[PDB]
Design a protein around this ligand. Structure first.
Ligand SMILES: CC(=O)O[C@H]1C(=O)[C@@]2(C)[C@H]([C@H](OC(=O)c3ccccc3)[C@]3(O)C[C@H](OC(=O)[C@H](O)[C@@H](NC(=O)c4ccccc4)c4ccccc4)C(C)=C1C3(C)C)[C@]1(OC(C)=O)CO[C@@H]1C[C@@H]2O
Ligand SMILES: CC(=O)O[C@H]1C(=O)[C@@]2(C)[C@H]([C@H](OC(=O)c3ccccc3)[C@]3(O)C[C@H](OC(=O)[C@H](O)[C@@H](NC(=O)c4ccccc4)c4ccccc4)C(C)=C1C3(C)C)[C@]1(OC(C)=O)CO[C@@H]1C[C@@H]2O
Ligand SMILES: Nc1nc2c(ncn2[C@@H]2O[C@H](COP(=O)(O)OP(=O)(O)OP(=O)(O)O)[C@@H](O)[C@H]2O)c(=O)[nH]1
Ligand SMILES: Nc1nc2c(ncn2[C@@H]2O[C@H](COP(=O)(O)OP(=O)(O)OP(=O)(O)O)[C@@H](O)[C@H]2O)c(=O)[nH]1
Ligand SMILES: Nc1nc2c(ncn2[C@@H]2O[C@H](COP(=O)(O)OP(=O)(O)O)[C@@H](O)[C@H]2O)c(=O)[nH]1
Ligand SMILES: Nc1nc2c(ncn2[C@@H]2O[C@H](COP(=O)(O)OP(=O)(O)O)[C@@H](O)[C@H]2O)c(=O)[nH]1
Ligand SMILES: [Mg+2]
Ligand SMILES: [Mg+2]
Lengths: 34, 428, 428, 428, 428
């Protein structure tokens, strides 16, 4: 979560979009786990 | 977000381009195979779908020999072959050949790459041209581009690092012609124009670096260091960050006066660095020394309309406030009346890197300076004199009128070099 | 009640606020998580002045961070207290500021205002009794000068009754970290006068002195100077946040300090300031803090009070003491140097006091002063404005955004009228 | 009682309907096997509104799936929640729609209605007290518009007293995913005015911004667009399903929103809505939900509320709260922006409220407004129609199915007579 | 369900078919021996009683020398020999021999094979002709065949991928004659007719993939790729499925105007894929580039009466919604007034599959563009010129009048091109 809120502020590149969506999926996974 | 497009025209432009694009891929850990083992490189690269980092540059030439060197050099895995542009014949030190005849068939190609290289950016700071005035491609073609650029964007900023025909040392014989013809058609298009020369950096290699074997690779190394310093504020943190927009507005008072000088310090080998502590004052003192300049122009015959100092490494801003104060107090340094101000200082926490097998040393401090001094009108007078000294005899003219030119542009470009020159004294 | 909304424009404004929101955050004992971890209920009573309730018992600062070129806002977010800010409380534009006050106030300002107003109103209604506004400017740069004043004009026309503070940092009389500084200085001054109520002026030079002589710092960095501004900004509202036998809202500071709706430029200083060594010799008494706050060095403005005349003044103490001492001290000094004060005001000081001290200390103080000596600041700016305007240098930039020359003339006159005001009541 | 039968026309209507039956299947906590696995009884007291019982304690939706080209119907059967539909609730034909409203409403529509009517009757007879119908159109394609309106005129003349909703997805004013789109718009509307009672309009464009700005979504797939439509479609019937201190049947929403029989084109929005970052900071109160709902962005159809005045409006809350706040919030909003409403209506909002929140949230809302803004949308389409119909482009397709040209002119005259109605009660 | 009957007349027709029926058996995993180790192949196959998959196509030709190659190539286990029709003698580049003398005796045979093939398909989407105008078989026979088709079906749709006699590169001397005669006949029979050309595809292999030895086997792989991206929605899932009925109602405004250009992107080799990212904005840009067409027409000499896009691979519909907007901003591209609509889009989640030994590289995105632009009336106008340039001499006419034709057909074939050329002007 702290990485996801530190990575933010103007996702501009394709790699940025991909990494942020990866963070979204990781978050969903761990929310299902806990 | 903060991305620049670097162009390298002529032979010299793509020569230093080899150094700069060696420094950068070294400074950011980029391997020659595209890939590295956030925004730290976005200014100079474009990460692909996965892994590779492609440099956002453009190598242009008409001589096939040199662009074919980077095609076989170790850095062929970096540049997309859409970037490397060549041509069957060359310009051969004729302006018309680069400008009128040969240029027009390939500009539609180069511009087709920029439209394919600009749309990749959402925040485009400004173009970054590397010229070499005195030849056919550099002067002739490069001028033909900026016109195609300014009609396209205009609102964008055009910056240029053009080496200049030295007064004494001259490898060409006809360069006064195309140089003068270059200056005319670039002026109303370029927004700012830096200038440098080999002979000065030759001395710079002699006095400080103390090398008796200066080849083109060394000079190209120094230009890599200077530009690596300028862009640090675009690609690194640090106190008093600077961007191109801020840079150009507080440095160009009038639309015409934009021709500027440069300097770098420290310029020291491995040994004397060990016998040195590199106080911020010493570095900013040498930076204003007229000998440490990269042009054979004497600023002590004019007044600094403005200055811009970019430091590097370990600096604290009071020392800058302290050192610049010590300089504004001296007497050899002159200024024009209407600007009691005139300094734009910047710092970066990122030290300067050194290239393995290179010539400089590992230092924790570094300073570069760019001044717009009206004393620059002097070297513009020598070339004002060589033109008429030869245009009277009409020597070499048959080439130009034989390649789709006329006598008019000889006259046309002539007056603007007088119209510019009188303007360099109206500011007094 | 008494909620306060906060703005941070420009680079520096985005930077000093990183400290101001870091000092306060520890005073009320909250962690960078936003969760409170102090000890006393007193941190919780008037916590609602600077923060908003959040889910899970968290507190986020009621701040707004506006700056073109979002590169800097990545820093604060990566900072130690950057996780507390609402990411929707960030507005930015990719284009650089350019410091052309026009584009900062005419073209690029206009693009973001509609967004900013949506953010202010979004949290203006989050207040039960909104007390007032406060900003963090920078007159040299174009972000704070352009947009901030552009925002200020928008705020005033939709919040006329509330009070607009201003922690603007003023350009220096000696050093100029930019070149077009006096231009954007005046064009902002032409907007502050009509749309501000209390405008402190602070300058990095005196900040360097306070850091150099008194605190005996070897290397004042930008954090330390911002660490100082954080302290004063925290001292101002100690009454709105903590108990006090003589409390002091901001609006009662206003009426008690500006006799005329136009003499609203102040001058500040903090107390005590001691290095580590002297701290073990000095003793904390009310007499100590008042002579130091009354010295002409602690004035972070680059003006000499001995050359002007205190119209009004004020002092805010925090720490358990005896209110008679502070009552007679200000009476002593008002008697002794009775030449630095005005006559037609019998008593020209307001001595507030708080019951809660700073975090680690037990006593402290803070001075505010509205002396005519500050008219020296605006006269220096005038000579720099008129000289270059006498030559119209750097001017094509400003007219390059639809501006005219009248706005330069008016802004000059308005400051000229202003410095004249500070002379009438300055009867020497 | 109060059961509702659901129809899913077209491809999109078949696809958004997949989510709508996936959300409500989770709200009431039933499994993809059709078996209930919730915990409370509130999941069961009013389950009969959306479902029909089955042997073995299974629940199957009272849904109809009508579409030509049965290809897409295999997708929804392949998805996670396809196994819950009765395979008899599938009407299809092999031939495609061709975006030709004629064949969708003249030739091939006439071949399936006799079958669909046999299916809608079979579960309209499965309801103890059928409240009304609700369909999911797509005014662009041929199936949704062509077959949809044909089915509607059939129901209306068979169930006159009941109420017919329509969750039509309107075309876009800017982007155009078909080419004959204006023809399918106008020819459908000419059927909706006379054969509907409540007709919401929803666009993809405004739904892209809502997904981009607020949710901070990078790539909104159609699932997410269909996901939001699912949320709203559930929000209308919270009162029909769950208890509430102030319940709202649909028949009372129509009478509270439609002063004149023809002004039944609504405008919808959902609340709360936020990303994963801001969810950590935003607090859930009635103020947040009423300011975000009354905003001009959440209106999922591409119209500016400001260019019109809300004739009436409505708001549907769900979650434990204090009914006083919702009473005064809509009292303030009606008082501040007194220009955004009409005068001949004293109080022009209805404030429903439900007692059970959504699945994972704690509070929520849903906005519905019969604003005169929508008149812009019909203005746009009535131009594109009169553009090509002035040139008779593509008209040979429609005359290929026995259609005439008067049918177009009558349809066009119907929209102008409609947009004239939105102007009368828009007195600027 | 959704199946197509793919015909291949002439040599080029069955040449390309050797590549299409290569990509298909690879795309779906079908081994060369008929069987793989539903609805994914039924569109292009027909599972036998056990195991094998026969391709639902017909290879027709009069020259035995090329059909007997498939009869012996590795692709004989796929084809049942009754498909591959042959003939003792060929047309020898005479339209009459292909249409009047020889073709009249084998249509009834092939008409039985189609009849034996149309019956196995339940839902027939449409035929898919591969004509090659410029020979005797493709022109004389194909034209004769389509007459025999429209008299049977008429309402059914007849597509066509007909290569066209190139302006510059021409490998025959009478192809101006037959080409004219073919169009005069196909026009009133077919309803949509793609055009493409060789030299326009020669350049693409030179400009993009940079193969200096293009061969008819290279072009055929590109025509193969075009169709796969076209028929994806016919055999795959994904947003905005497009069907042939849904493909032609919104693309042929007037019954006469149905000739349309083509395009494809990205078209790059393996290496130029590793220095790229290929955003949805890149592909949609190159797609609209007049250099990426496969016809030698200048779209910037006219406007777009309509257009269409068939994306492929991983795409989200907002960028298409956004990128098409960006194109609707540029001024180079035009659109007729009566068409403010005009972008029929389409997505498929199935990427493009690369054939081993092929020249293209693997990608995750691809765009096939199809546009009915009024600029095509120029390549129409060349053949208008050369025909009368020779028919003035009555050259080669003795063959045609000797083979069951007369001068009447030439005159009547002439007027129709004139009448069609005014039609491309009546739209302006
Ligand atoms: C053991 C002890 O008493 O050490 C002191 C200390 O010796 C001195 C030197 C402190 C110290 O301050 C500095 O070192 C300093 C450095 C650069 C610029 C300004 C200060 C101290 O850091 C500062 C710190 O002061 C506070 O905690 C205040 O409440 C202050 N807090 C902060 O500045 C702060 C903010 C975030 C994180 C940590 C500290 C404050 C100021 C204004 C409004 C509210 C709170 C304290 C008492 C001390 C140390 C640690 C040495 C002094 O500062 C303050 C603000 O008290 C500097 O001169 C004073 C006098 C103190 O005696
Ligand atoms: C821990 C937590 O609070 O996580 C939330 C969450 O953070 C947010 C961001 C959720 C989340 O939703 C999204 O991220 C989202 C993305 C695209 C499109 C729509 C939503 C959430 O998925 C949505 C989900 O909400 C629900 O489950 C609702 O009851 C909702 N459910 C569904 O739509 C649904 C249906 C089938 C399968 C899964 C979800 C609902 C709405 C109307 C009527 C009935 C139910 C929850 C609580 C969350 C997550 C998981 C992050 C939000 O969505 C809803 C409708 O609640 C997005 O805006 C809200 C605000 C929520 O705070
Ligand atoms: N500092 C520096 N100068 C260089 C270098 N290489 C070439 N130059 C200078 O470039 C000048 C010649 O410029 P050219 O590139 O040959 O001229 P042109 O415009 O390209 O026209 P053509 O020669 O016909 O291609 C000479 O004065 C060189 O000294 C280099 O590597 N470093
Ligand atoms: N794109 C492409 N064009 C081809 C190919 N082979 C031939 N063509 C062109 O098709 C045209 C002739 O095709 P044919 O099929 O041989 O002519 P025909 O219709 O059979 O008439 P006859 O030769 O008299 O039997 C010429 O323009 C060829 O260049 C190929 O493999 N690919
Ligand atoms: N106290 C303090 N002042 C700063 C700091 N950084 C910059 N300043 C001043 O801010 C001025 C530049 O203004 P800036 O905001 O960067 O330009 P703008 O974006 O156009 O407004 C300079 O004159 C600096 O002296 C800092 O970190 N601390
Ligand atoms: N929210 C959403 N809208 C869609 C979707 N698919 C299509 N639409 C829109 O629905 C319209 C196409 O209607 P369609 O049902 O495919 O044609 P029809 O079969 O003749 O009715 C177009 O405007 C599409 O943009 C989807 O999956 N989700
Ligand atoms: Mg050269
Ligand atoms: Mg042939």
């Amino acid at each position: 979560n702290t990485a996801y809120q530190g990575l933010s502020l103007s996702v501009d590149s394709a790699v940025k979009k991909g990494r942020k969506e990866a963070m979204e999926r990781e978050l969903a996974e761990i929310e299902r786990d806990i | 977000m903060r991305e620049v497009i670097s162009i390298h025209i002529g032979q010299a432009g793509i020569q230093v381009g080899n150094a700069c694009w060696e420094l950068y891929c070294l400074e950011h850990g980029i391997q020659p195979d595209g890939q590295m083992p956030d925004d730290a490189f976005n200014t100079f690269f474009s990460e692909t779908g996965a892994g590779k980092h492609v440099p956002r540059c453009i190598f242009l030439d008409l001589e096939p020999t040199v662009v074919d060197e980077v095609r076989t050099g170790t850095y062929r895995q970096l540049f997309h072959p859409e970037q490397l542009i060549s041509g069957k014949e060359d310009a051969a030190n004729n302006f018309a050949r680069g400008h009128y005849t040969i240029g027009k068939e390939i500009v539609d190609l180069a511009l087709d790459r920029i439209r394919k290289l600009a749309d990749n950016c959402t925040g485009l700071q400004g173009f970054l041209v590397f010229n070499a005035v005195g030849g056919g491609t550099g002067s002739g073609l490069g001028s033909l581009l900026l016109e195609r650029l300014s009609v396209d964007y205009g609102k964008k900023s055009k910056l240029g690092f053009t080496v200049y025909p030295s007064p004494q040392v001259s490898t060409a014989v006809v360069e006064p012609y195309n140089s003068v013809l270059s200056t005319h058609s670039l002026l109303e298009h370029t927004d700012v124009a830096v200038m440098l020369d080999n002979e000065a950096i030759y001395d710079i290699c002699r006095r400080s670096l103390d090398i008796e074997r200066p080849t083109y690779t060394n000079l190209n190394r120094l230009i890599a260091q200077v530009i690596s310093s300028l862009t640090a504020s675009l690609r690194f943190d640090g106190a008093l960050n600077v961007d191109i927009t801020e840079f150009q507005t507080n440095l160009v008072p009038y639309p015409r006066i934009h021709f500027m000088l440069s300097s770098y310090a420290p310029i020291i080998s491995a040994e004397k660095a060990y016998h040195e502590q590199l106080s911020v004052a010493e570095i900013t003192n040498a930076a204003f020394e007229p000998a440490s300049m990269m042009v054979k122009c004497d600023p002590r015959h004019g007044k600094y309309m403005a200055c811009c100092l970019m430091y590097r490494g370990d600096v604290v801003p009071k020392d800058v406030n302290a050192s610049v104060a010590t300089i504004k107090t001296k007497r050899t340094i002159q200024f024009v009346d209407w600007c009691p101000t005139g300094f734009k200082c910047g710092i970066n926490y990122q030290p300067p890197t050194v290239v393995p097998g290179g010539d400089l040393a590992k230092v924790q401090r570094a300073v570069c300076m760019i001044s717009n001094s009206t004393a620059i009108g002097e070297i513009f007078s020598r070339l004002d004199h060589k033109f008429d000294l030869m245009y009277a005899k009409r020597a070499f003219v048959h080439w130009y009128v034989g390649e789709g030119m006329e006598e008019g542009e000889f006259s046309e470009a002539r007056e603007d070099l007088a119209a510019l020159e009188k303007d360099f004294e109206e500011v007094g | 009640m008494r909620e306060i909304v906060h703005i941070q424009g420009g680079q520096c404004g985005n930077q000093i606020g990183a400290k101001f929101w870091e000092v306060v955050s520890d005073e009320h004992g909250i962690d960078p998580t936003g969760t409170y971890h102090g000890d006393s209920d007193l941190q919780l009573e008037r916590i609602n002045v600077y923060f908003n309730e959040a889910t899970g018992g968290r507190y986020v600062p009621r701040a707004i961070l506006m700056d073109l070129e979002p590169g800097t806002m990545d820093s604060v977010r990566s900072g130690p207290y950057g996780q507390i800010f609402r990411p929707d409380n960030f507005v930015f534009g990719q284009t650089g500021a350019g410091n052309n006050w026009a584009k900062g106030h005419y073209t690029e300002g206009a693009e973001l205002i509609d967004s900013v107003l949506d953010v202010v109103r979004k949290e203006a209604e989050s207040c039960d009794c909104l007390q007032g506004f406060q900003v963090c400017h920078s007159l040299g740069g174009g972000t704070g000068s352009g947009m901030g004043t552009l925002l200020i004009s928008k705020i005033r026309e939709e919040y006329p009754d509330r009070m607009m503070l201003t922690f603007s940092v003023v350009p220096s009389p000696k050093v100029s970290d930019t070149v077009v500084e006096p231009y954007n200085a005046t064009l902002s001054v032409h907007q502050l006068v009509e749309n501000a109520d209390e405008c402190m002026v602070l300058d990095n030079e005196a900040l360097y002195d306070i850091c150099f002589r008194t605190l005996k710092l070897t290397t004042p960095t930008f954090g330390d100077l911002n660490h100082l501004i954080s302290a004063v900004m925290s001292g101002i509202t100690c009454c709105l946040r903590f108990p006090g036998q003589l409390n002091a809202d901001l609006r009662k500071l206003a009426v008690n300090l500006i006799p005329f709706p136009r003499l609203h430029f102040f001058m500040v200083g903090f107390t005590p300031l001691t290095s580590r060594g002297s701290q073990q010799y000095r003793a904390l008494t009310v007499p100590e803090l008042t002579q130091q706050m009354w010295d002409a060095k602690n004035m972070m403005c680059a003006a000499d009070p001995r050359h002007g005349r205190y119209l009004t003044a004020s002092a805010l103490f925090r720490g358990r003491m005896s209110t008679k001492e502070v009552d007679e001290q200000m009476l002593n000094v008002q008697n002794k140097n009775s030449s630095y004060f005005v006559e037609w005001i019998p008593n020209n000081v307001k001595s507030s006091v708080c019951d809660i001290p700073p975090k680690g200390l037990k006593m402290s103080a803070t001075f505010i002063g509205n002396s005519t000596a500050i008219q020296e600041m605006f006269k220096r700016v005038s000579e720099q404005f008129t000289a270059m305007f006498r030559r119209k240098a750097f001017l094509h930039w400003y007219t390059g955004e639809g501006m005219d020359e009248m706005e330069f003339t008016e802004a000059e006159s308005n400051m000229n009228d202003l410095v004249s005001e500070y002379q009438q009541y300055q009867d020497a």
